[PDB]
Amino acid sequence: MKTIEVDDELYSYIASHTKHIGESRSDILRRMLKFKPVKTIKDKVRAMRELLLSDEYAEQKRAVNRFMLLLSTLYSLDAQAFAEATESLHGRTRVYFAADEQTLLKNGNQTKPKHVPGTPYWVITNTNTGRKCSMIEHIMQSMQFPAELIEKVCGTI
Amino acid sequence: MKTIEVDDELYSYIASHTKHIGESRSDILRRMLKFSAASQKPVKTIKDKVRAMRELLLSDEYAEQKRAVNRFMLLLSTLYSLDAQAFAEATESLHGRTRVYFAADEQTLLKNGNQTKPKHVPGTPYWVITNTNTGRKCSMIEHIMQSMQFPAELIEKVCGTI
DNA sequence: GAGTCGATCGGCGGGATCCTTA
DNA sequence: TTAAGGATCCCGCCGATCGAC
Numbered sequence: 001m002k003t004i005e006v007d008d009e010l011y012s013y014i015a016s017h018t019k020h021i022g023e024s025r026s027d028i029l030r031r032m033l034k035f036k037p038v039k040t041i042k043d044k045v046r047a048m049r050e051l052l053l054s055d056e057y058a059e060q061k062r063a064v065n066r067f068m069l070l071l072s073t074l075y076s077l078d079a080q081a082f083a084e085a086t087e088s089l090h091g092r093t094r095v096y097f098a099a100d101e102q103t104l105l106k107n108g109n110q111t112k113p114k115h116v117p118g119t120p121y122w123v124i125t126n127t128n129t130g131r132k133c134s135m136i137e138h139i140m141q142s143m144q145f146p147a148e149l150i151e152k153v154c155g156t157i
Numbered sequence: 158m159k160t161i162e163v164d165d166e167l168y169s170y171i172a173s174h175t176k177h178i179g180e181s182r183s184d185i186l187r188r189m190l191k192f193s194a195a196s197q198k199p200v201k202t203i204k205d206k207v208r209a210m211r212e213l214l215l216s217d218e219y220a221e222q223k224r225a226v227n228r229f230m231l232l233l234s235t236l237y238s239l240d241a242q243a244f245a246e247a248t249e250s251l252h253g254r255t256r257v258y259f260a261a262d263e264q265t266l267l268k269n270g271n272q273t274k275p276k277h278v279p280g281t282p283y284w285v286i287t288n289t290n291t292g293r294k295c296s297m298i299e300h301i302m303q304s305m306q307f308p309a310e311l312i313e314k315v316c317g318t319i
Numbered sequence: 320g321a322g323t324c325g326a327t328c329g330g331c332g333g334g335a336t337c338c339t340t341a
Numbered sequence: 342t343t344a345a346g347g348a349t350c351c352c353g354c355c356g357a358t359c360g361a362c
Contacts, residue, residue: 001162001163001164001165002162002163002164002165002168003160003161003162003163004160004161004163004168004171004182005158005159005160005161005181005182005183006158006159006161006182006183006186007158007159007181007183008158008159010183010186010187010190011159011161013190014161016277016279016280016281016282017279017280018277018279019279024162024164025161025162025163026162026163026164026167029163029167029186030167032190032193033189033190033193034193034196035167035170062323062324062325063324063325064323064324064325088221091354091355091356092331092332092354092355092356093331093355093356094355094356094357105320108356108357109357110320110356110357110358111356111357112320112321112323112324125323125324125325126324126325126356126357126358127325127355127356127357128325128326128327129324129325129326130325130326131325131354131355131356132325134354224332224333224334225333225334226332226333226334253345253346253347254339254340254341254345254346254347255340255346255347256346256347256348270347270348271347271348272347272348272349273347273348274332274333287332287333287334288332288333288334288347288348289334289346289347289348290334290335290336291333291334291335293345293346294334
């Protein structure tokens with residue numbers, strides 16, 4: 001993180017372009033400025049199905065563990081899509097995903113952020129299983145997965 | 158003179174737009190922020206506004222919204238960017254019996270009315286009260302749009318989606 | 320932070336419905 | 342006095358405390 005200094009007026013302006021909770025000046029600015037090959041949908045769907053059946057997935061003991069492994073895998077399938085599916089995802093006061101731990105600790109608290117393996121992202125953990133499904137569902141819907149797959153996946157969390 | 162954070166990548170992007178040595182990052186941004194508003198489509202003519210309101214309805218963002226208040230906000234937010242002055246004159250003539258609807262600051266809306274749950278319209282100096290049924294939220298859009306010289310039919314469509 | 324997960328439950332926001340005011 | 346506008350209040354959704362291991 002690097003630092004620049006803006007005058008009082010220009011500051012209020014950027015501040016007024018705030019859309020949703022927890023976004024940074026960086027976020028807001030890139031929006032105000034207009035500032036890769038991927039696997040097929042079938043291949044994506046296959047990978048997720050393989051995962052649900054995979055041994056690794058059964059070995060995961062608790063929800064939070066499946067939750068994480070699900071995110072790692074989703075991200076590996078389409079970084080761009082995951083990013084988009086994730087940047088608009090948050091709660092009333094808590095930010096759900098961030099590119100660093102501090103942002104999550106700063107906005108929420110006791111959110112128990114964990115870094116998502118094989119991923120530049122951190123996500124909050126202090127949530128019930130239900131809300132974990134909501135996040136996964138919302139993400140997969142955004143990433144354009146079949147409704148029936150999303151259903152089968154949330155049933156395993 | 159206040160301080161803000163910028164990811165290292167953007168910092169390199171803003172720096173590269175220096176047009177003379179020594180000028181503040183303020184001046185630079187002011188250049189971009191104002192002159193990059195020109196890469197955006199026109200909104201001067203009615204036809205351009207119609208095309209603009211049309212894009213909003215057809216947009217992914219407007220579609221993601223699940224609440225009425227949220228669609229409500231995107232509308233105000235967009236209507237303002239079509240014509241600043243027009244939005245203002247349509248605003249002043251828009252109020253209730255005891256409640257002020259639009260104000261430049263939060264306190265004013267918490268002063269005249271109460272339990273109004275006022276929010277801030279993004280990309281705008283304005284604040285709006287939210288504690289209102291859907292129909293009234295429409296009436297407000299109705300007014301603002303009727304005042305900004307929008308065709309009747311389009312107004313009805315827009316209000317239908319709130 | 321650091322023992323870890325996550326269900327229960329207080330609490331807030333959305334906005335229909337009910338109430339007030341002129 | 343009925344319309345027009347205010348704002349109470351129920352339900353659903355979010356946060357995070359604290360119980361269960």
